Every structure is written in C-alpha cells, then in structure tokens.
Design a protein around this ligand. Structure first.
Ligand SMILES: Nc1nc2c(ncn2[C@@H]2O[C@@H]3COP(=O)(O)O[C@H]4[C@@H](O)[C@H](n5cnc6c(=O)[nH]c(N)nc65)O[C@@H]4COP(=O)(O)O[C@H]3[C@H]2O)c(=O)[nH]1
Ligand SMILES: Nc1nc2c(ncn2[C@@H]2O[C@@H]3COP(=O)(O)O[C@H]4[C@@H](O)[C@H](n5cnc6c(=O)[nH]c(N)nc65)O[C@@H]4COP(=O)(O)O[C@H]3[C@H]2O)c(=O)[nH]1
Ligand code: HEM
Ligand code: HEM
Ligand SMILES: [Mg+2]
Ligand SMILES: [Mg+2]
Ligand SMILES: [Mg+2]
Ligand SMILES: [Mg+2]
Lengths: 787, 787
C-alpha cells in the first residue's frame, strides 16, 4: 500500500492503533506534535500520547467504542488539548476512522495541528468580547451592502440577531416610518456612498418604537485599492438630539437677546424637557451672594434624589453663578446629567457675562437698543421733571398681550418685529404732546397731559383699535390685543403712578384679554355711567322716544315768523331730562348722529304734514345737521324721500351745518352741498370761526342764512369793538341776499341795540322760548304779530 | 486492508492520482465537497475537479513536481477555492503527499472543508475592522495578567502596536514609567482581584509626555463564573476636557452673533487650537455650488496632510455645506478627529441655519431691530410705490461721520446710544410728509416730495444743523458731523436715485464731510450762483449799495397824495437788476432780513429829512417789514432811534406787516406791536388770508390800513361775487376808522368799478409807477392834484 509512505511524507499526523492499543504507525509530523520518536513509540502502548488529566480513563472509552460496530466514529470531534513530552499543551484537531481489518478493530487518527485555527478562535473570542463590551452598535457590509456581522448593542437597540439580520440591506428590515420624503431616500443613499459619510435616520425596532439613530458608513479598501468592506457604526442619538434641540433653542434665544429671567426660564424649560420630572435652580453671584435668576415651577418632591451642582464660571475663570439640577437617581444617567449641565453652564455663563455687562450700564443708558424708544430711566427723568414743574401727567401702561403666539409660531425675531410694527402704528397715530417709552418687554408707557375723561377714553379707544387690524407677519395675520392701565392723580409721585397703572394693567391682563381700566374706580364708575347713558340714548333713538321742540324766529320790522328751528329733546324715566348740550356730543362719540339726523328729518316732515293738514302756514323749518351726516354719501336720498313722501318740497325745509364743515375743504362735501342747495332746501351757517375768505367761498357755494352766535351777541353789550362783525355781516346780507339770524337774545336793550343795524331775523327768549309742538299752533294763532 | 478502508469513512476527503493523472481514490467526504459520486471520478482525468478557470493552467504543475521529485511539497499550503459539480465554490485546505514506490509516482491530496475555518478567518478580519472602528481605546487582558489584543485608538493615542504590546505586557511595566501614580499595585493585584473597577493614571507614550488616562476595567466570566478575561477601556481626560471646551467655546462665539465669515474663522481657529498644526476650512452651499466660506490663513504646507471632510445637514433636508480639516498624519487619534469633526459639523449646521434665518430677516422684515426705523426693503417698496404712482421723490442720503471716536472711547454700547440719539433728533425734526429710513449703519435716507431748491437747501441745512450740539454721552460731549447727498431727477427710478445720492455723499465724505451736495452738474452750479448772489447782497447791504423807490397812493375823490410806499431796489454790476421778489426770499433764507429792515428804516428817515429840508409835505411813508424782523426784542430801539435822530416822529411813518404775522398768535409779538403803535406809527395789513375774526382781533390790537391785494382786484373784473368782499371791507373801514388801499389798478374801468364802493385810496399803475426819489418832488409839484 502506498498510503504508508503517503502518510510518511504527509503534513498530517497518522497514529494508527491496533487491538491492544499499541501504536503501529508513527509519521514524522508526530515527532513535531509530541516530541517522540518512531523507535520510542512503535510497538508500545498509547499511554504516552494521552494528556495527564485522564490518562488511565481512556481505554474504557476505546473499549466502549470497540463493541459498538458503528461505521463512523462520531466521537473525538472537537478541538482538544494535547500535552507534549515536555508538558506543553498544544491544541489539536482529530479525525478518527474505525478499520475492521482481518476481524480486528483498528483506529486511525488524522491529527492536525489546530494551533493556528484555535489561535484564530481565541482571537475572535477576544474580539467578540471587545466588541460586545463597548455597547456600541457596529455592523459590517459587503460591496453588495448586505449585513455580514453585527454586535450585541445593535441587537439590543434594534431587536435583531445575526441569524435574522444577515444578507439583506439595512433598510429592507429597518424601513423608515410613514414619512417617505427624506428618510427612506437618505438611508438608501448612505448605503451607496463610496467615501466616508454619515447621516441621521428614524428606524423601526422589531417591536415598533421610533428611535433616532446616527449611522456612519466608512469604506475599508484592500491592498489593490479596491472596496473590500463598508463598516456602519450606529449611535443611539435620542439624548444627543435632545441636547441638540436644547442647543438650538438656547441659540435662537440668546442670538435674539431675550430678557434675563425669560432666558433663565427657557433654559430651565429645555433642561426639564430633556430630563423628565426634575427640579432646576439657577443663581447668579452678585457681590458674592446668590441671586435667584430662574427655576422651574414644577417643585415636585423626589425621594432619594441626586443633586448635581455646577459652578458657572466666567471667561477668565472667576466664578459667576451656581446651576443646580436635582433628579431621580437612576432615572437619567449621571454622565448625561454631566454633559447637559456643562452645556447649560456654558450657555448660562455667556448669558451671565452679558447680564453683568448690562448691569452697570442700564442705569446710565437713556434709550432702548431694540426699538429706539426712551427707556425706564428716561421715563423716570421725564416724570421727575414734570412733577418738579408741578404738572400732573396721565400714564397709560400698554401691555401688548398675545405675543406668545408669534413667539412660538415664528420666533423671537419676528415677535420683536411685531413689536416694532405696533410701536410704528403708535408713532403714526402719535401726537406732539405725548411721550412714548418702553419699560419692560411688551410694556410701554404713554405719558399724556390730558385731564378730561372723554379725551382719555378717546385716546384709549384709538390705542385699543390701532391693533384691531391684524399684524401681518410673513403673510400670517396675528390678532394682538392691548391691556391698558390708566393712572392719574393731582400729584403723588412717578413711582406711585407707575405702581397704580401696573396694578390696573395686571388686573386687566389676568381677568380676560383686551381692554382698558382706570385706577381709583371712582373714575371708572363714571365711564360705566356714561356707557349706560349711551346705551339708553341708542335704545331711545331706536324706539322713537325722542321729541322735538320748536323756537320761532321773528322778522325785525314786520314781526312775522321767518321760521322755526327744530331742537332735539329727550326724557328718560331713569336719567330725567338729558340736555342736547349733553347727549349730542355723546351721540357724536357713539355714532348716533346719523340716526338722529334721519329721525329729526322724518319727524320734522311729518309735523309739517299735520301743520299743513290744519290751517298753519309754517313758512320755514330749520333742522340741525352735523359733519358726519353730510360727509356720508347718502343724505340727499332720504332728504328727497322726506320731501316727496309728505309734499313738503324743499322751499320750506332748511339745514344749518356746523362751522367745522366750512373749515373743512372737501370737494365731495362741497359738491353734495351744491346738489342739496339745487333742490331748493335752504342752507345756514352758524358762528364766525371761518374767515371772510371762507364766507366769500360760501357765496360761491350758495347759502341763504348766516347766524350770529349767542357767544358774540352776549359780548355785543360790553365789547363795542365786535359791533363791526354784526355790521359787516348784515351789510353782506343786503349786498348779496343773505338773511342774518341773531341768536341768544334775552333783554329788550339787547334787542334794541341790534335793531339799529337792521338785522333780518331774531331768535331767542325775548320773543319765544322753545315751545312744544302741541301748542305751537296756539302761539301761531294768538301771538303773531308781535311788533 | 490498512490503506483503502482507512480513509473511506474518514472526515478528511481522500483523493489519489496515478501515473496517467487519473483519479483512483474517492470517498464520501470528498463527495460532500465535489457533488460527484464514486461512479464519475474514478478512471477519468483530473480535468473535471479543477475549477473551470484553472483547467489549462493546472496540469503543468503535476509534471513540474514529478520532475523535481521533492519529498515535502511546500505547494498548496494555503487555502484554495473549489468549484463543485453544480458550479458552487467553497474554500478547502489541502495536504499534499507524494509516493515514490514500485518505480511509480502517485499524488495524494487530503482535502478538508476549510469553509468553516475560512469563515472563522473572515469573521476575525471583520471583527478586527469593527474593533478598529470603535472610537475608544480597548485592551484585553488575560488571567496571566498580560496584554493580548489592542485597538487602533490605543495605537493612535499611545503609539504602541500589537506586535510590541502582544505576548508580554507593556501595562504593568509601562503604567508607571517615571511617574508612580501610586496605583501600580492596584493595576497588578487588585486589578485582577476585584470587579468593575476604574481610576485615572499618567501612563506615558512612545514620546513620554504626561497624559491623564482613565483605566476602566471589567472582568468577563466563563460558565464556571471564573476569571476568563478582563477588558480595560481608556479615555484621555485631556481629550475629553478639550472636546468639551471646543463645544463650549464654539457655542459661546456663536452666541455673540458674528458675521458668517467671522463665524467660519472662529470655528477654524478653535479646531486648529484643539488640533495644533492643522489647516481647516469651511464651505457653504449656494444653489448647489460650494462656495468658499472660511479658511485658515496659515498657508504653510502641511506634510502628509490627511484631510477629513464632513457634510453639513440642517435639522431635516438637503446638505448645506462642507467642512474640511487636514492635519499631519499621526498628529492625533482618528477617534479624536472624528469627534472634533462631528461637534464642529453640528456647530456649522447651527451656524448655517442661523445665517439662513438672518437672510430671511434681511429679506422680509421691513424694520431695523436697533432704531425702530424702516430698512432698505421698506425704502425700496416706498420709492417703487411712489415712482409707480408717477410722483417724483427727492432723496437725501445722510452719513454720520466721526463715530470711531465714540466707539474707541466708550465702546460699542455708547456708539449705539449715540446713533439712537441722532435718530431721535431726526424723528423730533421729522415732518408728516417726509419718510425716514436706515439703509445701513452710518447712513440714513430721508425721502420727501417737495422738489425745489429753496426747500431742498433748507431741509438739508436743518438736517446738517440738528447735530450742532455735541451728543451728551455719559456726561461727555462728542461732536459728530454729517455728510449729505441729494438726488432728484424727474421720471427716474429708485436705483438711479439711490446711486446718485450715494455718489454725492461719498464724494463729500472723501472731500472731508461736514456738508451736503447735489448730484449731477448745473445743480451745484445753481446752488453756487444763489450763494454768490447772497454774498453779493450781504456786502451790498453792508456797503449801502441798495436804493429805494416810491409809489404814490392817491385819494379816490380829491386826487390828493395819501402816502408813498418805499420799495427796495438793487443794482449790482454783475447781476444787473435784481427784483425784490428775487432777493427778499433770499434774505429770508440767509438771515439778511434784519439788516434790510434797519437799512430801509434808516434810509427812509434820511430821505424824509432830506425832503423836509425843502418844501415837501409828504403826509405818509410806508415801509415793508417781515415776520422775523418783529420776533426779536430790538425793533423799538432802532425805530425810536430813526425817529428821534431826524425829528420824523411816527405820525408820518407807517409799517406794513405780513398776513402770516397776524395768523400767528404770540403774546410778546402783540405786546411789541401795541408798544410800537403807542408811538404813533401806523400799521397796515395786506392780503386777506386771516379771517374776519382775526380782523376783529386786529381792531382790538389797533391798526390803521387794510390793503386789497392786486390778485383780488384783478379778479374783481371777472368774478362778480367778490365785489361783496370790497363792499364789506370798506363798510368795516367807515365803521371803525380804517383806511382801505386798493392795490394793482391798471385800467380806467378797473378804477371806476372800485370807485362806486368808495375805496379810500387807490395805488397802482393807473396813477403812478414807482418813481426814483430824485424826481419825486417833480411829480409832487407837477401832477397833484389828479382828479
Ligand atoms: N340762554 C339762552 N339760550 C338760548 C336762547 N335762544 C336759544 N337758546 C338755546 O340755543 C340752542 C339752539 O341750538 P344751537 O344754538 O344751534 O346749539 C344746539 C345745537 O348745537 C345742538 N342741537 C340741538 N338740537 C339738535 C338736533 O336736533 N341735532 C343736532 N345734531 N344738534 C342739535 O345742541 C345745542 C343746544 O341746543 P339746546 O339745548 O336746545 O339749546 C338751544 C336753545 O335753548 C336764548 O335767548 N337764551
Ligand atoms: N403789475 C403791477 N404791479 C404793481 C401795481 N401797483 C403796484 N405794483 C407793484 O406791486 C408791488 C407791491 O409790493 P408788495 O405787494 O408789498 O410786495 C413787495 C414786497 O413784499 C417786497 N419788497 C419790496 N420792497 C421791499 C422792502 O423795502 N422791504 C421788504 N421787506 N420787502 C420789500 O417785494 C414785493 C414786490 O414789490 P415790487 O416788485 O417792488 O412791486 C411792487 C409794486 O411796484 C400795478 O398796478 N401793477
Ligand atoms: C490529546 C489527545 C486525546 C484526547 C484529549 C482524547 C479524548 C477523548 C474524548 C473526549 C473522547 C470522547 C469521549 C466521549 O465521547 O464520551 C475520546 C474517545 C476516543 N478516543 Fe481519544 N483522546 C485523545 C487521544 C486519542 C488517540 C491518539 C486515539 C488513537 C486511536 C484515540 C482514540 C479514541 C477512540 C477510538 C475513542 C472512541 C470514540 C467514541 O467512542 O465515539 N484517542 N477520546
Ligand atoms: C480546487 C482544486 C485545486 C486548485 C484550486 C489547485 C490549484 C493549485 C495551485 C494554486 C497550485 C500552486 C500552489 C503554489 O504555487 O503555492 C497547485 C499546485 C499543485 N497542485 Fe493543485 N489545485 C487543485 C487540485 C489539485 C489536486 C486534487 C491535486 C492532486 C490530487 C493537485 C496537485 C497539485 C500539484 C502536484 C501541484 C504542484 C505543487 C508543487 O510542485 O509545489 N491539485 N495547484
Ligand atoms: Mg342752531
Ligand atoms: Mg348758536
Ligand atoms: Mg407792501
Ligand atoms: Mg400784495
């Protein structure tokens, strides 16, 4: 047989044993494997080749195998420790063969030196230990981008093992959630990058949780500079992204320069959002003492909690503050607490140097570096100057509320721009004698010098409705609102005024939303009374409870009634008699002048209808109209309706407009005046505030009557210089066909002094007090003529 | 036998080839590796067993080995690929033996399925790559207390390789090379005795520099819970503190909101300081084109520069930039490089997101967040709207020079306060029609609608003069100065207007500032002509080069001279005759009105004395004065001097004022007028801008003459309505003893139509043109009376 020399020249070792456990063959490699010799071993027992641990208990195994008769020798199949002659224990791999030759059971063993293979196995055991020890998910991929090796951290975080996660792309079994736009494409693209790269993904666990991971792919090239493998390292970056969101939010705050305490609050809120059910406290070092900058309002008690304190230092190393975080022990990892506290320490450190720089310069600066408005110090100086000069100012604290919506929808920058738009609206509606300043954030001060409650109410209404129009920000409306606190005393102090106005403003802010309120509710009950009176006036106008009273006008010489003026009256069961000189400005403020005009015109035409049905001539009726009633582009329609519904065509009706209308210069108003005058209804102008150039323009824009006011007729007695007004106006009267109507006559001397200038018509108490309609005909039929 | 059946049932596959290279042996072990059976391999050639890619190459090796005749075949000692019957390939390990018996040479090839062994080797290679990509130094220690396996980070941060550190231990002997650290006994005995230990060392490197390293040690137990292995992970405390400090410093720099290039440079310097001897640069993507953002100015060539590139990604979406850091090879650990790259990549992502946000801020917001003023965007919109409405705007570009003085002396905060001081001054002097904007920093833009030199120069002078008083910063003056460029051209656009204004402003700034300039030629030429004309007027007034010319006023009936009016005339050799309507507004603009008033009064009194020297009665002389002349508390002094230096007491002199003076309401001016009237000098009022109430107050503050303007007298011909104006004015005249003077008569019909109203006196071209004083007595002696 040629196998004997084949085994002699072979690399393996052949040790064939006969029935009596005697070695019948010994190849040269057996000398290297055992340190023996063929002369020493051949013919002798196998006891020399067995490890000393179990030398005598091995013929028992051999004998047990001998009687079985099985073909294959399934035993002796694992790498086993073999001890040499010198005592060294190498690792060998065996391969047995039962040879039943000539009725005798032989045993052949193809021993191979498993030293190198088991050194590889020891190396891979150590590498498995080192790769499962670090808790760092690492996978390895072929050029086809399929997983070939994974680790224990990867299994822990994704729930897949080497058996399941092998041969498939790391996206087929780790598909991203429903959102398909970017995650799937980025995950598929990272796997096919030929250079070192990395990305961040949402991957799905076997159970189904959403975990943000950071995957880093790097190629490993062979000797021939060819792609051999691609290793992917996954980092669980849930906490990393939490701290990154913290960094982003603190950056967006600090770069936008927020207030000190609000910055502390947002820092604390981010820390709590990263560390659930914890307590956070933050202190600055002022004069070496702790000053409480901010802390979370969630002061829940925690048992066996750990408190980590970090000394917030300055740039040069000097201490600046203390940042203390108390949290449940074991709920959040200590190293994560360290990293969060360190990053927040740097953030709050820069915030603290900024605040320290601002601290010794805020008392010296005079302007707000944001909106360009004067600051609290400038306001204090201005108020001190006012009180020293003995002037009583009125302070409006304006709180621009509902700013948090733009804060959390757009950002601090866009919210500050909303503030700028609001203050620019304030500037465009501002007045020369008003002082505007910013005290703290959304809080402004308007210092005015208006004493009247009506003026204060009008200013408050204009301030509250300037923000009624939505604020346009990035093509997104924002309905901001104002809480106004009004403080005013005869004089107490700037501190007192500010404190009272702040009390009012915080009351309004906490008890609802937009609105304005006085301090000292004795000045708010007045507003309530005026509002209820206005509501009563509106409902009386609606329900037709108003009344008109008529005052005859007389000719100078003939003693004949030129006309009667319809003066409004009101009588409420609760308020008694409300004078026109009290409810006409109220109607102007509310917006009831239009309704009053329609009502007076309709009632006047109706009463003309009855006084024509019965035998009364009623030559002319003068109806009072205001500025808004004429500026509205509707008047001639209802005036013509009033004439043609009762046959009272305009040669009888007359309108007296305010001198403010003549002072105003509006082409549309002038055209409407001309159209009305064309219809035959007369026109009268009272008072002489408008100049004689205005009166000549009024000659151009035709009228019929000019009224001399009671304020001038009263001084006609004493001031003899104003007789020229009456004389000249009368002269214009007979020059260009105007009727002059003296008002406010009360005494015989006052009438007879105007008698010489030959005034056309006279109206006042000297001839008839305003008489009710039910006895106007009695006066007509009894008194006229008067002479 | 002991040859054939020995290897038939063996695990090792046995194949034998004879002289004719024909296979003779084949066993089930080789069947399981080739796919064939014992009916297709015996007899036929070895050609089928070879893989298809090596069939022609293989057979020469057998012949070469036969020729060589060597006993031990060193060939095929490595693993070999194997092609099965079906075409699949597996790895196998060969043991080749040659037989020289019976004069024949056979070949036996004991094959073993090296599939599992080579899978183990590939697994070991993959695990080695994975451990090298672990980002933390890891060492594995045997129970014999020595070092077995290292990492790549360990080799990078200590310089010790697997060949040097393997077998023996450079841990017990190299942990305390020169510094004992008082923990060698811990690392020797307590390290293998306790479990889960850790401490800090000063273990040295190849260089020997002292570094603080963590030595976290954990034991790995076997099934018997015995000390199978240990693992020690290292972490450089210096590296950890440096990587925390890098993040802190970068975040602090980013919190200061620096420019984009400065932020890139700051990241560059921080990365270089963390990694000395490095060239670092950043690029930011722009529409897919990577542009240069920042780079390290140290351009010295770096030897063996390994470059690490990182791809910036925002919170979600496409890449935003690149960051490349090239450092000398071996300078720092790859894990250190990767950590620095990751931190700086997230920092650069934050910086790019912040710059995108700032681009949105500069692109959409219409207000500057430092002064509350509109920015260049609002300026563009306003000018575009105006030019689309086709109204020509006038643009002023103002620059506040000399700001570096405040910046250096008091810092940036007080420079900010100075800019807000100037902006508040602009706002205080601002007019409702004007629009104010802040294009950038030192510069501002004011947009107006008035377009004429007399107003442009005035508003530019006001803007330049608003900074006459130094800005009070911390009780310290600072004299800032203004450079203004003015642009106005009909029909042009905002780009042209802004460019021209900036050209003018830049030119004046380069020339030295402290002033303003128009764009384009002939505009500054008109300005210079006006300036030289004003200087000539000033010197002519000083040197008494002006003259007076007198226009007689006649009575309606008697044809007697009521008075003459003194009208200023000037004859300059260069400018010829300069009309009063041309040089009086110039005097108002410059400030020569007072000098003109003194000269006119003095010369009028001198000519009155000269005429009194001979036989001239000259009942009255009228002298024109302006508003600014009477607003100073000096008028009565020189007027009384003029009367009493020539005996021309005010019963002959007369003063006519502007209607704007009576429009104004000043108690001091009224008292001065009353005092002057008490001296006997008359007063006259021209034009009828003031109202009739103003005329009655004028009667209260007595006057003497009312003049009907030529503008009204001309329209008296056509507009028949304004006859009432004259009638009423004359009526007031005879009512309260005023003289009415009708100006600007030209025709006999114009005279006769005003005759019927009985106007007191008439002045115009119908009776006498303005005559020089040298022949005025000739007119007196030859013309009067006129009738
Ligand atoms: N002491 C005194 N007073 C005299 C004398 N002659 C008339 N009066 C008063 O003068 C007022 C006439 O209305 P007015 O002067 O246009 O001033 C009116 C007018 O401006 C307004 N007003 C009155 N009625 C209306 C109306 O229907 N509509 C509107 N829009 N305003 C009205 O209310 C003002 C006050 O009206 P009244 O309270 O009725 O006060 C009446 C009347 O009582 C007199 O010899 N002595
Ligand atoms: N076409 C025409 N013109 C007539 C007629 N009658 C008079 N004039 C002119 O009308 C002007 C009247 O001067 P003014 O209206 O007071 O307005 C004066 C006055 O405001 C100003 N002015 C003239 N002299 C003086 C002066 O000495 N001092 C001051 N402060 N202003 C003066 O210059 C203005 C222009 O006066 P002049 O150009 O000198 O022209 C004079 C006079 O010559 C007439 O029938 N037809
Ligand atoms: C380092 C050297 C050796 C070690 C560690 C060793 C140990 C073992 C072990 C563990 C078994 C299996 C026991 C069982 O399955 O219960 C076995 C069985 C056996 N050994 Fe060894 N032995 C060694 C040397 C040898 C040699 C040189 C031969 C030469 C013929 C041999 C012949 C056998 C036979 C025939 C069996 C019976 C296998 C069976 O019953 O399945 N042994 N020995
Ligand atoms: C998949 C199967 C086989 C492959 C891939 C293969 C390939 C090779 C290679 C690469 C060598 C050169 C090795 C070196 O230079 O280090 C070689 C040599 C040789 N092979 Fe093969 N072979 C295969 C099968 C066989 C078989 C089955 C036999 C004999 C039964 C054989 C006999 C030889 C001989 C005699 C040499 C000469 C070695 C020397 O002279 O040093 N080969 N073969
Ligand atoms: Mg009335
Ligand atoms: Mg009245
Ligand atoms: Mg004049
Ligand atoms: Mg004039």
């Amino acid at each position: 047989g040629i196998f004997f020399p084949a085994l002699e020249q072979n690399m393996m070792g052949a040790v064939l044993i006969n029935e009596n456990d005697e070695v019948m063959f010994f190849n040269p490699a057996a000398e290297k494997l055992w340190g023996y010799k063929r002369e020493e071993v051949i013919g002798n027992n196998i006891d020399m080749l067995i490890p000393r641990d179990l030398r005598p208990a091995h013929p028992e195994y051999i004998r047990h195998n001998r009687e079985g008769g099985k073909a294959r020798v399934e035993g002796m199949s694992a790498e086993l420790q073999l001890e040499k002659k010198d005592g060294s224990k190498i690792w060998t791999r065996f391969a047995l063969s039962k040879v039943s030759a000539e009725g005798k059971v032989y045993y052949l063993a193809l021993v191979r030196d498993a030293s190198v293979e088991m050194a590889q196995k020891e190396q891979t055991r150590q590498l498995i230990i080192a790769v499962d020890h670090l808790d760092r998910p690492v996978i390895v991929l072929d050029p086809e981008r399929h997983i070939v090796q994974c680790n224990r951290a990867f299994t822990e975080m994704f729930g897949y093992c080497i058996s399941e996660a092998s041969g498939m792309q790391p996206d087929t079994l780790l598909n991203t959630p429903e959102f398909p736009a970017d995650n799937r494409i980025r995950l598929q693209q990272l796997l096919w990058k030929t250079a070192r790269d990395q990305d961040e993904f949402l991957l799905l666990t076997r159970t189904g949780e959403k975990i943000w991971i950071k995957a880093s792919i790097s190629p490993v090239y062979d000797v021939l500079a060819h792609l051999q493998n691609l290793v992917m390292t996954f980092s669980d970056i849930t906490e990393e992204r939490q701290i990154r969101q913290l960094e982003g939010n603190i950056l967006a705050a600090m770069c936008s320069s927020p207030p000190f305490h609000e910055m502390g609050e947002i820092i604390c809120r981010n820390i709590e959002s990263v560390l659930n059910e914890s307590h956070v406290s933050l202190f600055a070092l002022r004069n070496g003492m702790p000053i409480h900058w901010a802390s979370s309002s969630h002061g829940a008690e925690i048992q066996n909690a750990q408190s980590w304190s970090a000394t917030i230092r300055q740039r040069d190393g000097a201490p600046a503050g203390i940042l203390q975080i108390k949290t449940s022990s074991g709920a959040e990892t200590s190293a994560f607490i360290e990293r969060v506290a360190d990053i927040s320490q740097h953030m709050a450190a820069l915030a603290l140097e900024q605040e320290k720089s601002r601290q010794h310069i805020e008392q010296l600066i005079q302007f707000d570096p944001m909106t360009g408005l004067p600051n609290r110090n400038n306001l204090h100086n201005y108020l001190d100057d006012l009180v020293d000069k003995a002037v009583s100012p009125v302070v409006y604290l304006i709180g621009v509320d509902h700013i948090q919506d733009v804060i959390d929808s757009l950002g601090y920058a866009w919210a500050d721009q909303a503030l700028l738009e609001v203050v620019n609206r304030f500037r465009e509606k501002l007045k020369p004698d008003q002082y505007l300043c910013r005290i703290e954030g959304t809080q402004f001060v308007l210092v005015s010098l208006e004493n009247d409650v009506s003026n204060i109410t009008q200013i408050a209404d204009e301030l509250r409705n300037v923000v009624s129009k939505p604020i346009m920000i990035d093509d997104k409306p924002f309905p901001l609102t104002l809480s106004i606190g009004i403080s005013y005393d005869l004089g107490k102090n700037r501190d007192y005024l500010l404190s009272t106005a702040h009390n009012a403003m915080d009351y309004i802010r906490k008890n609802g939303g937009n609105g304005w309120q006085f301090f000292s509710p004795a000045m708010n009950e007045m507003v309530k009374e005026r509002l209820v009176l206005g509501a009563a006036l509106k409902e009386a106008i609606s329900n037709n409870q108003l009344k008109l009273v008529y005052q005859p006008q007389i000719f100078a010489e003939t003693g004949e009634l030129y006309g009667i003026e319809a003066l409004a009256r009101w009588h409420d069961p609760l308020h008694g008699h409300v004078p026109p000189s009290r409810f006409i400005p109220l109607a102007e403020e509310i917006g009831e002048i239009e309704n009053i005009g329609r009502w007076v015109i309709a009632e006047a035409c109706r009463q003309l209808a009855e006084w024509r049905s019965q035998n009364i001539h009623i030559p002319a009726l003068s109806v009072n109209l205001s500025a808004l009633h004429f500026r509205s582009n509707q008047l001639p329609n209802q005036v013509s309706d009033a004439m043609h519904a009762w046959g009272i065509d305009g040669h009888q009706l007359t309108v007296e407009i305010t001198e403010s209308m003549m002072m105003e210069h509006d082409t549309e108003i002038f055209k409407r005046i001309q159209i009305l005058r064309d219809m035959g209804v007369g026109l009268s102008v009272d008072d002489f505030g408008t100049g004689f150039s205005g009166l000549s323009r009024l000659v151009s824009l035709p009228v019929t009557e000019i009224k001399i006011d009671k304020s001038f007729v009263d001084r006609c007695l004493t001031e003899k210089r104003i007789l020229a007004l009456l004389e000249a106006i009368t002269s214009i009267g007979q020059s260009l066909n105007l009727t002059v109507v003296a008002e406010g006559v009360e005494t015989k001397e006052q009438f007879e002094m105007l008698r010489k200038i030959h005034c056309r018509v006279i109206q006042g108490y000297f001839f008839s007090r305003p008489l009710p309609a039910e006895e106007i005909p009695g006066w007509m039929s009894s008194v006229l003529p008067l002479k």
